[PDB]
Single-chain antibody, 226 residues
């Protein structure tokens, strides 16, 4: 079993720097690219960048260029994220994420997250921001992009857990996703549908495009059980 274990919560004062770590187990980080993301209080996901643990190539989202620094220790199979000049604005849950390096994004692992509390672009639009459904109802959520994207991916997130790959490459279900779910679309318009809602489907759903940097997510659709 693959596990990405992150370091514990950090309580820091504005102005300082932290270094978080993420150690993989049952997977060699060198085999793909380690992504670092952050989920703010508003619960929106932001991509920070990736590092190629094999040759140290890195790609930082422009917003984090300068603020973040990725380094690795392949010997221990660990990736580090160093944030600088923290401000109250950086208070968030930081995640490390690694999945399929090429081709269909069929596998994906997330760290459990590290909460850092600071003491003082292809924009995707999801609709609707929130909705309610009773088990048995049909559900259709959309996600439109600013510029055409090759594929669209979807992640489901329940309260207190990290995101879980749900649908990859527009219409393929991730491992363990029930058949009642389906995805589709093309160009700049995509959607996720649930034929018949189940109580267990209530969660927040995010669409993500991996076609251009910085990778972006939709703000999410909270699907509440009615």
């Amino acid at each position: 079993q693959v596990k990405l274990q992150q370091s514990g919560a950090e309580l820091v004062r504005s102005g300082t720097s932290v270094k978080l770590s993420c150690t993989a187990s049952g997977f060699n980080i060198k085999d793909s690219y380690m992504h670092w993301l952050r989920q703010g209080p508003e619960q929106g996901l932001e991509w920070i960048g990736w590092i190629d643990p094999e040759n140290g190539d890195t790609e930082y989202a422009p917003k984090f260029q300068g603020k973040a620094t990725f380094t690795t220790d392949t010997s221990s199979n660990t990736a580090y994220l160093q944030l600088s000049s923290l401000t109250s604005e950086d208070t968030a849950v930081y995640y490390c994420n690694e999945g399929t390096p090429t081709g269909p994004y069929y596998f994906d692992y997330w760290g459990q997250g590290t909460t850092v509390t600071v003491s003082s672009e292809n924009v995707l639009t999801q609709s609707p921001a929130i909705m309610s459904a009773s088990p048995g109802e049909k559900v259709t959520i959309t996600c439109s992009a600013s510029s055409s994207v090759s594929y669209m991916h979807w992640f489901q997130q329940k309260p207190g857990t990290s995101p879980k790959l749900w649908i990859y490459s527009t219409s393929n279900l991730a491992s363990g996703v029930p058949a009642r779910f389906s995805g589709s679309g093309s160009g700049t318009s995509y959607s996720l549908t649930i034929s018949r809602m189940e109580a267990e489907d209530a969660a927040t759903y995010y669409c993500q495009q991996r076609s251009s940097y910085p990778l972006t997510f939709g703000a999410g659709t909270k699907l509440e059980l009615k």
